Design a protein around this ligand. Structure first.
Ligand SMILES: CC(C)c1cnn2c(NCc3ccccc3)cc(NC[C@H]3CCNC[C@@H]3O)nc12
Lengths: 65, 280, 273
């Protein structure tokens, strides 16, 4: 009856995307626009933008219709 | 589709029971277009599914799975007790729906007990996607019912993230433990005052960039009531979850995946099976 | 996300032969309905494709000077709407001009580019009576356009994949110095890929990567190691074959000629009148 976390299993048909918490220390955030402090007040970070851009770049790259 | 019953009337449309629920110059209404465009690209057991859409002239009708009730009817009901297991089950269904939604970069932005519809088999789905918007591109702060609006939104946040949903989730969690709205403000100022008089007035250490919000004004400091005093009968894991959901810093506030990975859901007891959830 | 979108499922096709089959089916269905209604006035499917390409260019020109400034996402969505509509419908039933204006209207609304109807129809270079008439036609055809799209309104463009690929190249490919050089020329290639049928045949990530690699090859730079190392030999061969098909599609494309388009325009007006 105990719940157990299992991550969502969604096939992307493309290369693996590095996780959000690892983008800064891998050098990705060095090539994206830095969030202004007003953005940071509301919870906006450049990590989200970089993550979404990479996920779009890698989504369905090895898929054939 | 043969109509069976009248279900309700909304600001933008009207819902009848056909078994499905059918919801019916600028042109086609933009809320309907938004619901159509967002519910077609999603498929999760905890998100309301759009079955088919059709209309006439400048009006359209959307077909949805029929929903027996919502969380607000359960909360306001007085003949049913809400055990910790039921609260955990509702919380789990809400958080898995929200995790799937956030993974696809969508903010619901209208989370409240009425927008959390419940199947006849005890399955919870997030509904009313008329305010939902995709997030993650470098918005209006007048979103979310005021009783569930986050302090960043009340302070005039333009760009935000999943936190504006999570705060509402926290509010909903509170409404499940006390059976009454947690922070029932009348205006933006009153809502902020109640937030600060219950949870304290955050400093710069709890929120490094408070004073950067355009609608931010300085409030007097408050000795916020301790959460174990507010939620007396709750447990330590539940208190940690509440503290994570009600953190003033939106970046530090727990996400849906982080909340699902907390010990509150893993600890005994397990969530109540959907077929055994209470029915009004 | 694209990898579970409706565009991948219902609007990506295995071959352009199937696309031609759908267009011919539409043309012959209109012909049968017309002859049932009670000839040299009809148009062949290749002529319909010529007119469709001409009016896709017209939609591009309409969106390029639109005020307030229209984001690239709205334009791409409108053009994909036009292509999807005229896959299963004929230009001799629904006029392409009203259809492209309705495509722009619906794209603006769906993309969350909030613009009111009066300022949208003020962008048309017509008289106020003509603008009101155009608005009326657009409002008439909005629901029909939505129905012909099967209520699939979210369109995945290659612009965000392009940005993500550039970020990844800046981070993980130090062999290529200044990846931003590729931004311009690859952009050009993207434009050309928009004019062909590739938007219905492939994925946005593949289009973006094809544009980037074509720009690099034109610049005199190889990025095979990017695909092999940074990015399975069978998978690599599949990707290279997809890229080759992309380049062949862009090479074989021919713009519509002025005289042919004028003849087709008078013929189409005769069909509508
Ligand atoms: C349109 C779709 C999401 C839907 C499916 N079932 N259902 C029901 N069922 C009747 C009901 C609901 C809640 C409590 C008692 C009875 C009512 C209803 N009312 C329309 C709005 C009202 C405000 N809250 C969200 C609802 O969708 N919308 C729907």
């Amino acid at each position: 009856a105990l719940y157990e976390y299992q991550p969502l299993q969604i096939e992307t048909y493309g290369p693996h995307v590095p996780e959000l918490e690892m983008l800064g220390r891998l050098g990705y955030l060095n090539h994206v626009r830095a969030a202004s402090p007003q953005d940071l007040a509301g919870g906006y970070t450049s990590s989200l933008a970089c993550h979404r851009a990479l996920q779009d770049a890698f989504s369905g790259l090895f898929w054939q219709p | 589709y043969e109509k069976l019953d009248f279900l309700g009337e909304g600001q933008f449309a009207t819902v009848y029971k056909a078994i499905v629920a059918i919801k019916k110059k600028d042109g086609i209404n933009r809320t309907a277009l938004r619901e159509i465009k967002l519910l077609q690209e999603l498929s999760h057991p905890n998100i309301i599914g759009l079955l088919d859409a059709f209309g006439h002239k400048s009006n359209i009708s959307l077909v949805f799975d029929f929903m027996e009730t919502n969380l607000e009817v359960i909360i306001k009901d007085n003949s049913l007790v809400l055990t910790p297991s039921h609260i955990k089950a509702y919380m789990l269904m809400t958080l898995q729906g929200l995790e799937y939604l956030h993974q696809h970069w969508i903010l619901h932005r209208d989370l409240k007990p009425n927008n959390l519809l419940l199947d006849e088999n005890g399955v919870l789905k997030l509904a009313d996607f008329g305010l939902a918007k995709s997030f993650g591109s470098p918005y209006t702060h007048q979103v979310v019912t005021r009783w569930y609006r986050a302090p960043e939104l009340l302070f005039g946040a333009r760009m935000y993230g999943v936190g504006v949903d999570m705060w509402a989730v926290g509010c909903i969690l509170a409404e499940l433990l006390l059976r009454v709205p947690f922070l029932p403000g009348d205006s933006d100022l009153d809502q902020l005052t109640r937030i600060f008089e219950t949870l304290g007035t955050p400093t710069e250490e709890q929120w490094p960039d408070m004073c950067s919000l355009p609608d931010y004004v300085t409030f007097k400091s408050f000795p916020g009531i301790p959460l174990h005093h507010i939620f007396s009968a709750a447990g330590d894991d539940l208190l940690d979850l509440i503290q994570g959901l009600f953190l003033f810093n939106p970046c530090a506030r727990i996400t849906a995946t982080q909340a699902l990975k907390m010990k509150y859901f893993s600890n005994r007891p397990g969530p109540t099976p959907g077929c055994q959830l209470p029915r009004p | 996300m694209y990898h579970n979108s409706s565009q991948k499922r219902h609007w990506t096709f295995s071959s352009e032969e199937q696309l031609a089959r759908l267009r011919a089916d539409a043309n012959r269905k209109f012909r049968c309905k017309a002859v049932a209604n009670g000839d040299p006035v009809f148009l062949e499917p290749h002529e319909e494709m010529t007119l469709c390409k001409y009016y896709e260019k017209r939609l591009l020109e309409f969106c390029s000077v639109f005020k307030p400034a229209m984001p690239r996402s709205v334009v791409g969505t409108a053009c994909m709407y036009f292509k999807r509509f005229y896959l299963n419908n004929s230009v001799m039933e629904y006029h392409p001009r009203i259809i492209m204006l309705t495509c722009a209207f619906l794209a603006c609304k769906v993309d969350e580019f909030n613009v009111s109807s009066p300022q949208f129809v003020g962008n048309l270079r017509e008289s106020p009576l003509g603008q009101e008439k155009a608005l009326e036609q657009i409002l008439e055809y909005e629901l029909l356009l939505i129905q012909q799209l099967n209520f699939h309104l979210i369109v995945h463009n290659p612009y965000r994949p392009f940005e993500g690929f550039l970020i990844d190249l800046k981070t993980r490919y130090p062999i290529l110095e200044n990846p931003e050089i590729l931004r311009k020329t690859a952009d050009d290639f993207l434009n050309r890929i928009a004019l062909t049928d590739a938007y219905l045949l492939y994925t946005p990530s593949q289009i973006a990567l094809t544009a980037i690699l074509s720009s690099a090859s034109r610049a005199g730079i190889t990025m095979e190691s990017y695909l092999s190392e940074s990015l399975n030999r069978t998978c690599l061969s599949q990707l290279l074959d997809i890229m080759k098909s992309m380049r062949n599609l862009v090479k074989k494309y021919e713009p519509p000629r002025s005289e042919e388009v004028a003849v087709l325009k008078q013929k189409l007006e005769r069909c509508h009148s």
